[PDB]
mmCIF file with all atom_site columns, C-alpha atoms and ligand atoms in Angstrom:
data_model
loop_
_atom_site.group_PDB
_atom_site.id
_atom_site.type_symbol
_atom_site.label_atom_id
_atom_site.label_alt_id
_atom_site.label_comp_id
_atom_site.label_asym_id
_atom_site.label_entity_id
_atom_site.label_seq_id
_atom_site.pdbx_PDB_ins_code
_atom_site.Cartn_x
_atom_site.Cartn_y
_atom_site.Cartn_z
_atom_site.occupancy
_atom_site.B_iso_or_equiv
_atom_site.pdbx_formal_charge
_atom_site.auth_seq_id
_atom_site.auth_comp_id
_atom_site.auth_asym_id
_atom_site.auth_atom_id
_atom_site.pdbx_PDB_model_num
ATOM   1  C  CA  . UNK A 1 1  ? 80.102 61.635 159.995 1.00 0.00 ? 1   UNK A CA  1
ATOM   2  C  CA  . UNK A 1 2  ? 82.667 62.799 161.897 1.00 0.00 ? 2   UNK A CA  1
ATOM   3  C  CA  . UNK A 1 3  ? 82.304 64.207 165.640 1.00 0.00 ? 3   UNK A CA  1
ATOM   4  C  CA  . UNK A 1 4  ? 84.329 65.244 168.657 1.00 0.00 ? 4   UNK A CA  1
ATOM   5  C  CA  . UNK A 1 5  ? 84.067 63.165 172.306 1.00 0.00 ? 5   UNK A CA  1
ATOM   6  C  CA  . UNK A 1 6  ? 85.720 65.819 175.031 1.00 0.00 ? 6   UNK A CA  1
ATOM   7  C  CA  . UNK A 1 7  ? 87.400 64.400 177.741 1.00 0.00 ? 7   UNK A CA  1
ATOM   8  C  CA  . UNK A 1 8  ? 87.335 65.444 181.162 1.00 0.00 ? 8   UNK A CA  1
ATOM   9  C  CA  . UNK A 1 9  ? 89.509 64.816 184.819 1.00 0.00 ? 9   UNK A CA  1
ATOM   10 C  CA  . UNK A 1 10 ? 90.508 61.439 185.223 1.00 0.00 ? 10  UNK A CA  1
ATOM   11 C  CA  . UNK A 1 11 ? 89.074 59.799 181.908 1.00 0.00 ? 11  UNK A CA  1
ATOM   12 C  CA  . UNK A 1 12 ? 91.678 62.913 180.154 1.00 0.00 ? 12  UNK A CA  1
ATOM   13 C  CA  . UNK A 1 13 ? 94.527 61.790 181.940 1.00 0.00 ? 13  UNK A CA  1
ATOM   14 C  CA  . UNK A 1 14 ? 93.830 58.209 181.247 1.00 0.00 ? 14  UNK A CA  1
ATOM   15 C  CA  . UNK A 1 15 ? 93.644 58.859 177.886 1.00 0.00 ? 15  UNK A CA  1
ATOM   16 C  CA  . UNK A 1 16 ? 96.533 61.762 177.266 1.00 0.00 ? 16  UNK A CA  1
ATOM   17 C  CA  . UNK A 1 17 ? 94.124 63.872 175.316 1.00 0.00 ? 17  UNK A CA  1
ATOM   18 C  CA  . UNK A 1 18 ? 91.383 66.578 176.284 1.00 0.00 ? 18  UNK A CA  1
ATOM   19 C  CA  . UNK A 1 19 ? 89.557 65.945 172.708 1.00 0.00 ? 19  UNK A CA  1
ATOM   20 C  CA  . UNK A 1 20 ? 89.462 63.351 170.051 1.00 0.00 ? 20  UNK A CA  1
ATOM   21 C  CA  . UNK A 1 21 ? 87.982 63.093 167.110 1.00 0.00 ? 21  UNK A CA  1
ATOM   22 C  CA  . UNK A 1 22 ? 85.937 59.816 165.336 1.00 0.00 ? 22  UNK A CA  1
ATOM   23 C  CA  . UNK A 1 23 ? 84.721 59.109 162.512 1.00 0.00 ? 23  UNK A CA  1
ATOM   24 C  CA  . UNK A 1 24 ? 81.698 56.727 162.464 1.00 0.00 ? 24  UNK A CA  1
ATOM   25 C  CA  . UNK A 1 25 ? 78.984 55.436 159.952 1.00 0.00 ? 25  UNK A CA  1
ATOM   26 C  CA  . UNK A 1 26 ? 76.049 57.477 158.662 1.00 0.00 ? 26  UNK A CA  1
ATOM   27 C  CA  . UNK A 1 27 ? 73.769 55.542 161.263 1.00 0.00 ? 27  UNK A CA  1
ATOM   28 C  CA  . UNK A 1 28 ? 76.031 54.980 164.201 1.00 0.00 ? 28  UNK A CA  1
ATOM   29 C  CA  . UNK A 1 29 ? 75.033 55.661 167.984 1.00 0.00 ? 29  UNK A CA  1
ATOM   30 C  CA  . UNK A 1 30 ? 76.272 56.889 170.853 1.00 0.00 ? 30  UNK A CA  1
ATOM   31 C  CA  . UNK A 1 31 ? 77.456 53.757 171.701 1.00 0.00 ? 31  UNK A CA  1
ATOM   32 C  CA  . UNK A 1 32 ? 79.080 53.357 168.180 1.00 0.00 ? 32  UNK A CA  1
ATOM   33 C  CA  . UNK A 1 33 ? 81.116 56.306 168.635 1.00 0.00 ? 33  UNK A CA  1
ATOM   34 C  CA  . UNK A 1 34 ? 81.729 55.279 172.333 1.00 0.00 ? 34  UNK A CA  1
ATOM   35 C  CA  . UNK A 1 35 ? 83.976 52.441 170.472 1.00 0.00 ? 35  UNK A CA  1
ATOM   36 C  CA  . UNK A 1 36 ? 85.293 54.170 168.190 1.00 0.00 ? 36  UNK A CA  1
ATOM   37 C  CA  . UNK A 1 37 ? 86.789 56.519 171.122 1.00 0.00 ? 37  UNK A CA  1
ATOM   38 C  CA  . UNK A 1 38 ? 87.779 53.271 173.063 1.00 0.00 ? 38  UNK A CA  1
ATOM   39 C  CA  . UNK A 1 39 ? 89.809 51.943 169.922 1.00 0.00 ? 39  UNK A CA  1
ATOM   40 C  CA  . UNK A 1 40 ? 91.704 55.167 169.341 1.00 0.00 ? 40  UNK A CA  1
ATOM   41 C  CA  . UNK A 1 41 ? 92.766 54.963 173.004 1.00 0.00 ? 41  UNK A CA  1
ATOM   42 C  CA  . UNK A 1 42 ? 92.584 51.646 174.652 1.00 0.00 ? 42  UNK A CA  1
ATOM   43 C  CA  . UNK A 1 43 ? 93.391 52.836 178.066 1.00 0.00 ? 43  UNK A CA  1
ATOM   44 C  CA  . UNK A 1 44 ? 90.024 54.129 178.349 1.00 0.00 ? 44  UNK A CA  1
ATOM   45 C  CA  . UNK A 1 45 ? 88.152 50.714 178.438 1.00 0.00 ? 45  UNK A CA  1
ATOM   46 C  CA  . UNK A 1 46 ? 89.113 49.629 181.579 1.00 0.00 ? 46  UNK A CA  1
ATOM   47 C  CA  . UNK A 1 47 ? 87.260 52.952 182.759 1.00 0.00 ? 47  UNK A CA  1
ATOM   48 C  CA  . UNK A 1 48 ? 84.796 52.777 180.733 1.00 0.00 ? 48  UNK A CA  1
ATOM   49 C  CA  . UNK A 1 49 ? 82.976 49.301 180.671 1.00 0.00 ? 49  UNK A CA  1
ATOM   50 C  CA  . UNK A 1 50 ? 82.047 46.577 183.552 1.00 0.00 ? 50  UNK A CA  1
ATOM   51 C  CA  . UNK A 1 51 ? 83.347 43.199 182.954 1.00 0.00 ? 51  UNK A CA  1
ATOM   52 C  CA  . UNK A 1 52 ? 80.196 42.843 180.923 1.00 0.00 ? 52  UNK A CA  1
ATOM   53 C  CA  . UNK A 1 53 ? 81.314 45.387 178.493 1.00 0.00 ? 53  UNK A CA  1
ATOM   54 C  CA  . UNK A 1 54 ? 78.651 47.969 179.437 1.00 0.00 ? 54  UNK A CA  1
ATOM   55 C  CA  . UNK A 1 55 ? 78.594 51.478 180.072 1.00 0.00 ? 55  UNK A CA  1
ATOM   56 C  CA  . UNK A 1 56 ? 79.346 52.221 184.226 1.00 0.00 ? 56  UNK A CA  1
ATOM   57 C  CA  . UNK A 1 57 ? 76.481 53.751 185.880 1.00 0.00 ? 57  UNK A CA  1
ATOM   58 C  CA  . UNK A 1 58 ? 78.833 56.202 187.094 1.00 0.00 ? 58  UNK A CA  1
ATOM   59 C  CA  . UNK A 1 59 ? 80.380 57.198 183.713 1.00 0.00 ? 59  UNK A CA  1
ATOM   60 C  CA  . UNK A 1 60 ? 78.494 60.532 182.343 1.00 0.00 ? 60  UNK A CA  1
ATOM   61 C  CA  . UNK A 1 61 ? 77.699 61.150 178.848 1.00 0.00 ? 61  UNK A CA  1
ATOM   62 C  CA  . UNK A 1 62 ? 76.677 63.743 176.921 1.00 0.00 ? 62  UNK A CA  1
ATOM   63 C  CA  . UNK A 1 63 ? 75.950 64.447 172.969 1.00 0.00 ? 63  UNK A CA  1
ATOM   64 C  CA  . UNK A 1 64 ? 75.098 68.435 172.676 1.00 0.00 ? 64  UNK A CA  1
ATOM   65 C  CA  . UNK A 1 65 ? 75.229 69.313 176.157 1.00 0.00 ? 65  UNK A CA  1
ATOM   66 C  CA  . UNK A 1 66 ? 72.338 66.981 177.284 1.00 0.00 ? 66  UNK A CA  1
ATOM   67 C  CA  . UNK A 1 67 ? 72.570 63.123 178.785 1.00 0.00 ? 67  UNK A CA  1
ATOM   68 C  CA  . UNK A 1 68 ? 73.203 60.524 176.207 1.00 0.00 ? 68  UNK A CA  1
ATOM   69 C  CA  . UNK A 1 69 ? 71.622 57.348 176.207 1.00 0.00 ? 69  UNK A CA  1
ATOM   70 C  CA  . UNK A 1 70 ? 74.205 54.818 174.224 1.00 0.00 ? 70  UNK A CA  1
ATOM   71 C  CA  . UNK A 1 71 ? 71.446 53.760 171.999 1.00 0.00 ? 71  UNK A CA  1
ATOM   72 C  CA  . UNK A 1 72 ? 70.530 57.577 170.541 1.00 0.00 ? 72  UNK A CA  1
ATOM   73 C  CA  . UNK A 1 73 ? 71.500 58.214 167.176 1.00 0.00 ? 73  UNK A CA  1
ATOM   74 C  CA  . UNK A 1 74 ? 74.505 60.456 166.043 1.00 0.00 ? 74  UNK A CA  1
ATOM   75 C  CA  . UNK A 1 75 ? 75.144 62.949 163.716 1.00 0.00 ? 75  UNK A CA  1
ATOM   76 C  CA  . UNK A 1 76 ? 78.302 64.771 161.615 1.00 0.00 ? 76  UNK A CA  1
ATOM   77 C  CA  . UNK A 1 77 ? 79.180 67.845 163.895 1.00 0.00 ? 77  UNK A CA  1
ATOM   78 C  CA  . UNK A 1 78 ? 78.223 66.231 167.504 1.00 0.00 ? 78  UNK A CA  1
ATOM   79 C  CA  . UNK A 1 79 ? 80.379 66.862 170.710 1.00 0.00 ? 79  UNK A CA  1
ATOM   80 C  CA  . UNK A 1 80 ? 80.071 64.129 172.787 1.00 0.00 ? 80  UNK A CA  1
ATOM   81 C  CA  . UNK A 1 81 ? 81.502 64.073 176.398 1.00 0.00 ? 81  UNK A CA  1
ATOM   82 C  CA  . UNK A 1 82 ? 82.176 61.813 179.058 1.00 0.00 ? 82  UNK A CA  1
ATOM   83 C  CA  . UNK A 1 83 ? 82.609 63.206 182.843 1.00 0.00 ? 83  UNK A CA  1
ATOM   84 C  CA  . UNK A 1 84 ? 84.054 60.757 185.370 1.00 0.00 ? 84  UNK A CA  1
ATOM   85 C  CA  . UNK A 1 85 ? 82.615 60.781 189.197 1.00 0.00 ? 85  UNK A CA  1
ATOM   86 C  CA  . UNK A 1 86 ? 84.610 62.755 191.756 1.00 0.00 ? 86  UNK A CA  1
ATOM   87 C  CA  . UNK A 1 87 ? 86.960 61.225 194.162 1.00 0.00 ? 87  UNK A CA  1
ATOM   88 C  CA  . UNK A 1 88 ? 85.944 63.252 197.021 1.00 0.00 ? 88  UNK A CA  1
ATOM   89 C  CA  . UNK A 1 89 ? 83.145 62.431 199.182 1.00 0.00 ? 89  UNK A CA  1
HETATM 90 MG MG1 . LIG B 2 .  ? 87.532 45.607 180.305 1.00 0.00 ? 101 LIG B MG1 1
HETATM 91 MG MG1 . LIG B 2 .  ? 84.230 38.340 182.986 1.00 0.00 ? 102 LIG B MG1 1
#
């Protein structure tokens, strides 16, 4: 199905858009759709994932308003977002 990541401070700027759309498989996760965002803009993945291609600690999720493990499962109509920490103390 087809859903919407929003994209917020720093992780926006990074990646020249405030909303993009994916469209992943019938049985994709969080983290599936995580890729798919990374793929449409690769400027993000330096941002996004350690060296060991995980998910930062300090990157937030969301899918419907609520934290997102990267293994929960998806559906057609989700917002997704992903908050970056704050540069001030
Ligand atoms: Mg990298
Ligand atoms: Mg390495």
């Amino acid at each position: 199905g087809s859903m919407e990541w929003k994209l917020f401070a720093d992780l926006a700027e990074v990646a020249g858009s405030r909303t993009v759309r994916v469209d992943v498989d019938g049985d994709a996760t969080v983290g599936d759709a995580l890729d798919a965002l990374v793929g449409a803009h690769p400027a993000l993945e330096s941002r996004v994932f350690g060296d060991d291609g995980e998910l930062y600690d300090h990157i937030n999720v969301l899918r419907n308003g609520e934290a997102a493990a990267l293994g929960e499962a998806t559906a057609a109509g989700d917002e997704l977002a992903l908050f970056p920490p704050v540069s001030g103390g």
